[model samples]
Target: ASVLSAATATDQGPVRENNQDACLADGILYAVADGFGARGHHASATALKTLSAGFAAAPDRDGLLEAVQQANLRVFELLGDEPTVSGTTLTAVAVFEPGQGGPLVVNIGDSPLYRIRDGHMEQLTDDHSVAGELVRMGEITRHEARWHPQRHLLTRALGIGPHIGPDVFGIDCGPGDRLLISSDGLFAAADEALIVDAATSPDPQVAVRRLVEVANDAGGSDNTTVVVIDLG
Candidate 1:
């Protein structure tokens, strides 16, 4: 019915010189943004800041969507003329006010939002990457896409273009439901089976910590950011 616990963890990983991923864990909204290229860190930070400020100003679905659009504009502008060279992926979840509605998810790029209930884990957002498209076209399985050479090639992302149509929708959420928002780094290092198990921890803090640890153990090839929210 309401958020009972929330926790987040992030790592720059062993391969990267600096972390380019950013996250937000506000009471009503939780998000993860993974940036790439030269100004990537700034791109992700700018996007999250826009969303935070936008949401703070107006706490509703329209405002949330506007914030994402604004986020895209800001990031697009941040890149100046090289919008295609650097960008960020944004994936978020917004829990509505009491009786307003169920949880809403908005995403662009490859970061992901997953919902876990009982012992099953379901991905609520789609990956807007080349590998994702290939998987959707039935050329590769979900597992294979994770290891695809073009997995990191994003089809859409903030700062990439002037317009963005993020996947936005609602999903059933109830007491005991657990939601997760993560950068591609986590999924890249660990598979779905590993994530499902790590996310099953009773404590949100433990769940996030375990996920980060697992990703790093598996090679930690990229920056990783994970946020877990539990409903009670």
Candidate 2:
């Protein structure tokens, strides 16, 4: 295992009265859950609690993988009346070397998980949104999809009926690589270039605050949450 430095920050935004996004930076576990808005904070908070708590007991890579199922189960318990019920997006990454069963990243819903290697940034998880599908199908450009009105509609989330829960995969982590997990509020408030710049700034806590500030300064229509993990 490698020494990890992590920080978390969240804001309700200028428009929203209450924040629905939840996050954790517990040792090797870094996570974020965004539940749309007033109509959905319960799902987000519930999912994050289970994710963070499960990580404490099972701190291994497999535990990180298993936590998704745990979160999904709770999601259904909270809002399982209908198949398309409101649920939160859970995106997380457990940092470890290839030896401890390998480093892994997992995601569900539209919240984004990012990795920075050598100074370049790449998203580890794809957005599971209607706009995301349009981009994947070549129907729209990422820039165009960003402003699409249907951007908030999610195709999948924690426990949205028989969906393939979280998308788990092996991710590479080394001395200098950094990981950033955030809700749509942060990205939607600013842009990818701003995120890229802030993540590589002075430090994680400072960068996380800067991210929230940027989001609020823009519009902050929804709750913004972020977690930055630096590996050493």
Residues 1-232 of candidate 2: C-alpha lDDT, one tens digit per residue: 3646788899988798788888877666778888853347888878878888887888887777677788888777667875456778888877765667656778888888887887788876778899988987899987888789989888887855545556788876677887888999887757667767777875888989998888877778778898888877
Candidate 1: misplaced stretches above 4 Å? 82-84
Error of 1 at 104 (Å): 0.5
- Model number with the top TM-score: 1
lDDT of 1 by residue, 1-232 (tens): 6888999999999999999999999988999999999989999999999999998898889989999999999988879587348889999888886665667889999998888999898887789999998987888888777678988889988877888999999867789999999998987767667878898988899999999988998899899999999998
Q: After superposition, how far is residue 29 of candidate 2 from its true place, in Å?
A: 0.6
Error (Å) of candidate 1 at residue 56 is 0.7
TM-score of each: 0.94, 0.89
Q: Which ten residues in a row are the worst by lDDT in model 2?
A: 158-167
